[PDB]
């Protein structure tokens, strides 16, 4: 009258869940007055 | 008969690596081009 021992292992990686944000990095400002054509 | 040994999964919550590192985005040029001399 004995059942088994279903000690289900864990997940070696499991829900690591990397953010996967995706690179938005946007250095996008050289807008300092670039010598405007007003001379 | 006797108990068992571990092992199971199917899909233990797939997550996905991070997206990427900050790009250069849309680097600007300047406020206005043409000349820096006095108008």
């Amino acid at each position: 009258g004995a059942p088994g021992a279903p000690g289900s292992q864990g997940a070696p990686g499991l829900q690591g869940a990397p953010g996967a944000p995706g690179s938005q990095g946007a250095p996008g400002l050289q807008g300092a007055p670039g010598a405007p054509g007003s001379q | 008969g006797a108990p068992g040994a571990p092992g199971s999964q199917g899909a233990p919550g797939l997550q996905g690596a991070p997206g990427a590192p900050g790009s250069q985005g849309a680097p600007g040029l300047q406020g206005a081009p043409g000349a820096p001399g006095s108008q």
């Binding site: 010598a35 054509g37 001379q39 | 043409g34 000349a35 001399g37």
Partner: peptide, 5 residues
């Protein structure tokens, strides 16, 4: 540019 300098 041919000028502005």
């Amino acid at each position: 540019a041919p000028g502005s300098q």
